[PDB]
Amino acid sequence: DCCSYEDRREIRHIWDDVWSSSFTDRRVAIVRAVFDDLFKHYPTSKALFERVKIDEPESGEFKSHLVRVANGLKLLINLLDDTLVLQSHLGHLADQHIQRKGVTKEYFRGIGEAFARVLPQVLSCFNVDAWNRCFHRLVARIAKDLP
Amino acid sequence: DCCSYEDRREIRHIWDDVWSSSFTDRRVAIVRAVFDDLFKHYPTSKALFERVKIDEPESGEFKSHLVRVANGLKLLINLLDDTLVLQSHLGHLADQHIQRKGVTKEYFRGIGEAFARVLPQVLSCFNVDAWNRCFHRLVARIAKDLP
Amino acid sequence: DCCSYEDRREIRHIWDDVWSSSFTDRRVAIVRAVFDDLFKHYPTSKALFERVKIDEPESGEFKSHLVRVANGLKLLINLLDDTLVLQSHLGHLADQHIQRKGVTKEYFRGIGEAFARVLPQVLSCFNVDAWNRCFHRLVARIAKDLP
Amino acid sequence: KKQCGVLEGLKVKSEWGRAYGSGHDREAFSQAIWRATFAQVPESRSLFKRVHGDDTSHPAFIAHADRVLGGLDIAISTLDQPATLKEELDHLQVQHEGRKIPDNYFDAFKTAILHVVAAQLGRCYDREAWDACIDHIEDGIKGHH
Amino acid sequence: ECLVTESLKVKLQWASAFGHAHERVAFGLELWRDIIDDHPEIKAPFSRVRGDNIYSPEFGAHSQRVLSGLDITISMLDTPDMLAAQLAHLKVQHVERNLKPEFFDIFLKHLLHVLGDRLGTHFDFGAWHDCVDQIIDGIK
Amino acid sequence: ECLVTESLKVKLQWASAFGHAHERVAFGLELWRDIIDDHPEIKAPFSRVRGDNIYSPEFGAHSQRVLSGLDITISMLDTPDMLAAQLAHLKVQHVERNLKPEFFDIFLKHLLHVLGDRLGTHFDFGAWHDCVDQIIDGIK
Amino acid sequence: ECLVTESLKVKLQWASAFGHAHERVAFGLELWRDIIDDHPEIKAPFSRVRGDNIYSPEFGAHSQRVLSGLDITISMLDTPDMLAAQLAHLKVQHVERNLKPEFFDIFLKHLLHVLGDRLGTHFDFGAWHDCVDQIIDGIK
Amino acid sequence: KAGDKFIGDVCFDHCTKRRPEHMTLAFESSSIAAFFTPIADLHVHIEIESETDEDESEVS
Amino acid sequence: QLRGFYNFGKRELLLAPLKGQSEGYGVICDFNLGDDDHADCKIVVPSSLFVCAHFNAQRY
Amino acid sequence: HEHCCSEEDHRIVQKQWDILWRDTESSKIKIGFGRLLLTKLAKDIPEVNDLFKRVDIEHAEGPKFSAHALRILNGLDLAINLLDDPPALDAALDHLAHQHEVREGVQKAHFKKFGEILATGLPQVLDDYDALAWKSCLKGILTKISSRL
Amino acid sequence: HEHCCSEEDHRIVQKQWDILWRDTESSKIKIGFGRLLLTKLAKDIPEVNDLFKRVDIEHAEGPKFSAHALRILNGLDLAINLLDDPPALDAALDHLAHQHEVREGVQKAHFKKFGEILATGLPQVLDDYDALAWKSCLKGILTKISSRL
Amino acid sequence: TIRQLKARISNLEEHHCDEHESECRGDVPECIHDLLFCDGEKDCRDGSDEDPETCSLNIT
């Protein structure tokens, strides 16, 4: 669906509350907590990240990964005001996942649920709906490509 | 006599009404309409512009000319706030007409009358006197060089 | 001890009244009048400036000197808002006097008295104390190596 | 109610940051808290007889208050990381054991904190969360069950 | 040549950037300064219009005359019959004098650099490059 | 490696300088422009991301992706275990392809020049040089 | 020589441009940065005053000391007896030591470039060139 | 007028070290020049009751 | 339905949805004309406190 | 002295000391910073290592010490935050004096050094630092804290 | 529902669509633009050329078509300018539906395409374009216009 | 009527205090932190509080 500019503004703020810590510690725990919810629900996906060593949670090879994911999301949100660019990188973000053999359209809808369950716990005043709306628009375009 | 600052302001505005659009179209028709009045009164001058092909009104070789004239006037007016430069280009503008064999001191006084008859028709709120005053100061310095 | 910020502001202003115009004339007469008071009290120091020809008051080789002194002071005051830099140039200003054989720790305490007696005469609303305070902090460090 | 754990901690730790504040807001924040405490259990004034508990506005007490919140800060602040918190709590535990402390007062003091904090934060403030953590912090000071 | 939109875009942006009255002289000056500092070889032909002192009225005048012509060309371009004519007219004022071909490639480089500052990120480089270029070649 | 303060200083200054939303694209743009004007040889590998027109969205996207990574590395720095890992990760994405090592020395030159403008005199050149350098070598 | 007016003009413009307090440090910094980026060979003699990091207090101090002297010379300038003396005084502080001749020609280039920005189009290039030049040669 | 006393209650004192609670302002004399209405010249005693750390100080 | 308080210092009325709605809307009203009656209210989103709409109010 | 730690003086200090606590991870900072500050002290004067022995200074990253790092660093906070209320600040510091009086081994020369260290450290984390103002205030604080031996 | 197609959304569209009519020669623009828009439509779907036959689409520059170019392009204006009054806009569009219903040959797929074209064109004349806002609004418009067919 | 004017007027200039401090009602300007209300007792020296315009019925 489409989303509304106000909602974007809502999120562009809601995020500034989760992101907000400067460096890694916080964002890590959150993005992690997100994935843990993805794996507890779609255990299958777990295997996909052996390349980054998920078997070693505190590895660092993996922590760094989490961050990259976080930052990749950050980059998206922080692009919501520049549509045209977002629309492109959003594609580029798809291609980076289409070439990743084993990534289903489902796993995405799954990580989406993840945030919607985690975020509301890491910060108050979370407009779950607004988030959900704009997150879906983002996911759809990411996922869609692969098919 | 001299030009008052107020008068300059008056013109710096009056002009913004004739020049205004980016388009040649407008300025052309006006400058043309001006010359047509110069030729209807001092038909002799007509011959002077065979070099630009006045015999072919819609030529383009001529239209471009009209524009150059227009723009040359524009340049003058848009210099009324920088006196010293105006005083120089005003001279340079003379020399470009002194080397043009056949240009009388009269033809100028004639094109002056032209505007004073045209402009008041292409726009309302035209301070004919104010224009006339500063236009003469401009012409005087242009023409004079020639004889 | 360290100087109060208000006092600095006081001086940063008091000075703007003696330094004044960009002219030499004024600053000269003042800095001179300052030295004349240094020499009338510590006549020994006089000799130190034969290099700049003090025997020729209106020399110019000397006048220029006076100015350099003035300006050197100016530079100090105009640095009171950039502490760290002041602290360095303040040192550099010491070294330029340590290598000047014959300059005592006393002569400085003496020129300090000088200003405190001159300035209050060249301008009104002079916070002698405030000046004295920050001037001492400046002098102390300038001597400071030297002895 | 609930118990402590990672998120509810981060929340309180953050919200506390806003409520605590600094400068005068602090000198008052504490003031308010104590007034609310003593108003609940006037009996307790007797314990702070040493630091002018009779006049909540006396410098001695002002210091005391600002000094107390200080610890609470370390507690909450440190809370988030178990390793460190553990230590601070243990440290406190010592300064207290051998003293018996009525659980009646701690209760009031918590209430106080909560009411003031809520007054200070306006709208963004989770009650349960604070309750849970202020509790965990207090338990660590009473130290006994 | 241009596109129709690729022109309007320039015609429009030129408006905001160039400006009116003094705002222009400022533009012209800033432009020529950057140009002459990069390639002082140019101070040569500008000898007639005191090119040594770009702040002078003599040069200032020139500066303006130039920009003005540029204005014309830019205005011209959309309607082909006028442009083709105007361009031809400019070619003549140049062919006769000897000039360096590369000078214009330089002029263009800066004109864009400057408009870049004036217009900011909105500046449609593409449109300008494709469009002003066409104006330079005809002249040259 | 770098000093634990020398990092926090950069981590902090990066914040103010880089900025948020549009403020960034502006930064990225200003940066790459200065870089490409100094060494046009770079427009080559940036062929995939329309490096000819840095104002284009295609390049704009790129520009951002880059700075972002730089953000990671920098916020990576503060805690060594993550940085060491992140850096190693970046080195791989580069080694494979061939580059000219001096390009990065250039990139750094400008990144500092730009931050210089943004931050002013407070800009802790020392800290950055010592610190961003460590991020460049790793990639190369 | 110079003209008496050509001096007063500079003496006056220097005032507005240079400025007061911090406004100066900013000027100095901006100046030296542009200079060192153009000719990094200079970072050499400025080794004593941390020329590698121009943002440092050590260099900052220097920067100021310099500008100050320039202020003097300029303030000397109008009245010949003081200038002749001041200049002679500067020559000594230099002769003893090695410096390149061309370095100053560089310094001047930028000092004008910078004042150009600060003062705008009013900047009397002529007056400055004719006037600051005389100050460089003498010291030189 | 003349003779008036005015009591000032502090509320913002960067200015003194002690900051006093109060500050009395006694007007001793007041005379207007015969030619000038516009300006009336005054002579005033500014009284102060401070407490110093050591002792108590009084000022006028 | 809303819950909230009134800030003396702020002169501001701050209300949010009581609960349990999960989307409820809230409202901020500033006193400070100095008047009683009159206030500068703005309907916000109880989350972020982001202005959904604005209305200058009077009593009733 | 009397002049110094004026209102403007500390108003400044206070403002500059706040640049630090802008981000929620104050703990990580306060600790790291306080940790370093004490370490660099034991570095220049070892007889200190024995004083902080009680708090396992041997393990800088050890919670035992990390906690301490806070307590101290946090005390400095209290001092600074009470700069605008002399009577309170006074009391607050006097109390700190007593907490140090009963800790034998701690001598004045220690604070003098810690001061010098603190003064060289702050400007490394704060881009805006006014040495004059700070030195003025830190002096008053450090002195009153040790002044009782 | 509501949220899609918002006040802010269209407030934006409206603002951006105005960047166009700043100069008095709107006709030259509206025409040229509308001309191109319809042309590029017939380009991708020829069965259109027969529909616009009635307006001499064969002669793009022909007054017959130029006039048309306006009417349509100008209708889009009306739509946009009524975005802030749903009931009116509604009525305004419904009317447009009927004007297209009785023109056999015109099928939905046509609008879908015209939409894609319009979306690729606008950003070429407007430096400030918010694809998201526009697409949201253009959709609502194009749909309501063709719904009745 | 006049009363209503002095009111309308008075409600509308700055107050010294930075946020979440309010001035004591009375003659002294002085600013105290918002929170301290109430001790139950007069936080203020002035006791401006005790005055009706503060404890008022209508307001509450």
Swiss-Prot record, chains A, B, C:
Keyword NAD attributed: no
Coarse class of the primary localization is secreted
GO molecular function list: heme binding; iron ion binding; oxygen binding; oxygen carrier activity
What S-S linkages are listed for this chain? C3-C134
Which locations, inside or outside the cell, does it occupy?
Answer: Secreted
Q: Where is the Globin domain?
A: 2-147
**What keywords does the record list, in alphabetical order?**
Disulfide bond, Heme, Iron, Metal-binding, Oxygen transport, Secreted, Transport
Q: How does it assemble?
A: The extracellular hemoglobin of the earthworm consists of 12 subunits that have a hexagonal bilayer structure with a molecular weight near 3.8 million. Each one-twelfth subunit is composed primarily of disulfide linked trimers (chains A, B, and C) and monomers (chain D).
Give the family, as the similarity comment puts it: Belongs to the globin family.
Q: Which residues bind heme b?
A: H97
Write the protein's name.
Extracellular globin-4
From Swiss-Prot, chain D:
Checking InterPro entries in the record gives: Erythrocruorin, Globin, Globin-like_sf, Globin/Proto, Haemoglobin_extracell, Mb-like_M
Judging by the UniProt lineage, the source's domain of life is Eukaryota
Similarity-based family: Belongs to the globin family.
Q: What are the recorded GO MF terms, alphabetically?
A: heme binding; iron ion binding; oxygen binding; oxygen carrier activity
CDD domains in UniProt: Mb-like (cd01040)
Q: Does the keyword Cell membrane apply?
A: no
Under which name does UniProt file this protein?
Extracellular globin-2
Q: What keywords were assigned to this record?
A: Disulfide bond, Heme, Iron, Metal-binding, Oxygen transport, Transport
Q: Where does heme b bind?
A: H96
Q: Which cysteines are joined by disulfide bonds?
A: C4-C133
Subunit and partners: The extracellular hemoglobin of the earthworm consists of 12 subunits that have a hexagonal bilayer structure with a molecular weight near 3.8 million. Each one-twelfth subunit is composed primarily of disulfide linked trimers (chains A, B, and C) and monomers (chain D).
Q: Which organism is it from?
A: Lumbricus terrestris (Common earthworm)
Residues annotated as domain Globin: 3-145
A Gene Ontology term for the protein's cellular component? extracellular region
UniProtKB/Swiss-Prot annotation, chains J, K:
Q: Does the keyword Signal apply?
A: yes
Please, which domain of life does this record's source organism belong to? Eukaryota
Globin domain residues are 4-149
Which InterPro entries does the record associate with it?
Globin (IPR000971), Globin-like_sf (IPR009050), Globin/Proto (IPR012292), Haemoglobin_extracell (IPR014610), Mb-like_M (IPR044399)
Keyword Zinc-finger, does the record have it? no
Which of UniProt's keywords are assigned here?
Disulfide bond, Heme, Iron, Metal-binding, Oxygen transport, Secreted, Signal, Transport
Gene Ontology cellular-component annotations: extracellular region; hemoglobin complex
Q: Which residues bind heme b?
A: H100
Q: Where in the cell is it found?
A: Secreted
For this protein, the record's SUPFAM superfamilies field holds: Globin-like (SSF46458)
Q: Main location per UniProt?
A: secreted
Entry's Gene Ontology molecular function annotations: heme binding; iron ion binding; oxygen binding; oxygen carrier activity
| Pfam family membership, one | Globin
Q: List the disulfide bonds.
A: C5-C137
Record note on quaternary structure = The extracellular hemoglobin of the earthworm consists of 12 subunits that have a hexagonal bilayer structure with a molecular weight near 3.8 million. Each one-twelfth subunit is composed primarily of disulfide linked trimers (chains A, B, and C) and monomers (chain D).
Query: Its family?
Result: Belongs to the globin family.
UniProt-recorded name of the protein: Extracellular globin-3
What organism is the protein native to? Lumbricus terrestris (Common earthworm)
